[PDB]
């Protein structure tokens, strides 16, 4: 994809780790799971506007070589079209044609 789409993906994940690993449990304690009779103490609801583009949900994984935005395979870290080219040369170890 465009070099900007590859650039967007790096900034989202670097901030996902920075903010959202920390601010996951502001979500967890205060809003969802353990808000149950511990109230919903209304800090978080205000807070989370500057985090907006750092949600772990607002990433789609999408290929750490070619940057294809679809068809990904998280089992390898690659995607359809390019994965097979590596499998063809035998650089994905143990991988070969499937017969049953």
């Amino acid at each position: 994809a465009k070099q900007s789409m590859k650039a967007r993906e790096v900034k989202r994940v670097a901030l996902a780790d920075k903010y959202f690993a920390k601010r996951a449990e502001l979500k967890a304690i205060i809003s969802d799971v353990n808000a149950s009779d511990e109230d919903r103490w209304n800090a978080v609801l205000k807070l989370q506007t500057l985090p907006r583009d750092s949600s772990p949900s607002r990433q789609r994984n999408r290929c750490r070589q070619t940057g294809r935005p679809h068809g990904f395979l998280r089992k390898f870290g690659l995607s359809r079209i390019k994965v097979r080219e590596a499998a063809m040369r035998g650089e994905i170890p143990g991988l070969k044609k499937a017969s049953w």
């Binding site: 304690i29 353990n34 149950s36 009779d37 511990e38 919903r40």
Partner: protein, 70 residues
Amino acid sequence: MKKDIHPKYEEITASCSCGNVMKIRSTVGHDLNLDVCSKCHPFFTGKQRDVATGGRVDRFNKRFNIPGSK
């Protein structure tokens, strides 16, 4: 009232005091008085905080100690 216009009027006259049990009376049917709407919805019901049906045992702060040896 010629004789051959045949009413069923012995039956229609008969059995004349009917109960609330037998045939409801005119003392039943105004009872649900008026047709009611209340526009103070849930979350207008003073609920600024919400909680699910059931599961209310053991509520305290424990920060995610739920895995059995992860």
